[PDB]
Amino acid sequence: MLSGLNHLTLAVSQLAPSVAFYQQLLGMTLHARWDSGAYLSCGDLWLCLSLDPQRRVTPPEESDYTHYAFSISEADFASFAARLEAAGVAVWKLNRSEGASHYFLDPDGHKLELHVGSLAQRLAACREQPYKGMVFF
Amino acid sequence: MLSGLNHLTLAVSQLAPSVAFYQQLLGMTLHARWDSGAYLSCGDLWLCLSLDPQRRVTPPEESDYTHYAFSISEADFASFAARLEAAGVAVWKLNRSEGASHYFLDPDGHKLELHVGSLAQRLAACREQPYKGMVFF
Ligand SMILES: [C][C]N([C][C])[C][C]OC1=[C][C]=C([N+5](=O)=O)[C]=[C]1
Ligand SMILES: [Mn+2]
Numbered sequence: 001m002l003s004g005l006n007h008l009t010l011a012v013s014q015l016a017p018s019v020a021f022y023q024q025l026l027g028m029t030l031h032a033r034w035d036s037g038a039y040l041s042c043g044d045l046w047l048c049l050s051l052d053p054q055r056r057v058t059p060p061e062e063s064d065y066t067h068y069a070f071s072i073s074e075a076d077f078a079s080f081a082a083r084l085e086a087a088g089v090a091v092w093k094l095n096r097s098e099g100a101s102h103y104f105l106d107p108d109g110h111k112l113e114l115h116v117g118s119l120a121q122r123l124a125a126c127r128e129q130p131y132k133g134m135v136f137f
Numbered sequence: 138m139l140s141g142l143n144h145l146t147l148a149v150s151q152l153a154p155s156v157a158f159y160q161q162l163l164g165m166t167l168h169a170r171w172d173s174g175a176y177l178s179c180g181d182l183w184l185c186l187s188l189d190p191q192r193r194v195t196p197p198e199e200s201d202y203t204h205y206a207f208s209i210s211e212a213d214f215a216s217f218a219a220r221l222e223a224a225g226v227a228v229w230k231l232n233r234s235e236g237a238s239h240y241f242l243d244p245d246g247h248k249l250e251l252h253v254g255s256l257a258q259r260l261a262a263c264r265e266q267p268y269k270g271m272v273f274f
C-alpha cells in the first residue's frame with residue numbers, strides 16, 4: 001500500500017541556477033549536492049534536482065498542465081508572490097479557482113504554483129458548487 | 138515560507154483509464170471525479186488528474202528524468218512491484234541508483250516510482266556510497 005509522496009524529482013538543464021532558484025529564491029533547505037544533482041527539503045517534501053541533458057527549457061505554451069503546487073499560508077502569500085515578481089519569475093496562468101494561487105515557472109519551465117488551501121477545503125467548496133459532471137465518493 | 142507540496146497535478150489524455158490506474162491499480166483513494174478531472178489522495182498527498190487535450194502519451198525515451206515517487210514499506214514493496222509487472226505496467230528504469238525503487242509508467246507515460254525509505258535514510262546510505270562529487274550540508 002502506498003503511503004504518500006516519497007519524493008519529487010525535477011530534471012534540470014543547469015544545476016547551479018536551479019539550486020539557486022529552489023534554495024535561495026524559494027527558501028528550501030539544501031541537504032546535499034553532487035556533480036549531477038541535489039537534494040532539498042520543503043517541509044515534508046523531498047525534492048531532487050537531477051541534471052539531465054535531455055531537459056529542454058520549455059515555454060509554457062509547449063507543455064501540458066502537469067504542475068507542482070507548494071503550500072504557503074494566506075498571511076505569507078502576497079509577499080512571496082511579490083518576491084517572485086521582483087526576481088522576474090514568469091507567470092503561466094491567472095488564478096480563477098478557490099484559494100489563493102500564484103502560477104509561476106522554474107528556470108527550465110517546470111510549472112509551479114503557490115496554493116493556500118487543502119483538499120478538504122477544495123472538496124467542501126465543490127460540494128457547494130460542483131463542477132460539471134461531478135460525483136463524490 | 139513554503140511548507141511542502143500542496144498538490145501534484147498530472148495532465149491526462151483520457152480521464153477514465155487514468156482514474157482506474159491510480160485508484161484501482163495503485164490503491165489510491167478517489168474523493169471526486171467530474172467530466173474534466175479527479176481528486177485522489179495517497180496518504181497526505183493530494184493528487185489531481187486533469188483532463189488535458191495537450192497531454193501526449195509519451196514514451197520514456199522521449200521524456201526527461203522528471204518523476205514522482207510514492208512511499209511504500211519494505212514489507213509491501215516487492216509484492217506490489219511484482220503485481221504491477223504481472224499486470225503489464227510498462228517500465229522505464231532498471232538500475233537502482235537511489236536505493237530500493239521500482240520504476241514504472243502511467244498510461245500517459247508519466248514517470249512513477251515505488252521507493253522504500255526517507256530522505257534521511259538516503260543521505261545516510263549516500264555517506265557510505267556517495268554519488269560522484271557529493272557534499273553534505
Ligand atoms: C466524461 C463524460 N462521461 C464519460 C465519457 C461520463 C462520466 O462517466 C463516469 C463518471 C463517473 C463514474 N464513476 O464514478 O465510476 C464512471 C463514469
Ligand atoms: Mn494546481
Ligand SMILES: [Mn+2]
Nearest residue numbers: 009206235250
Ligand atoms: Mn526517484
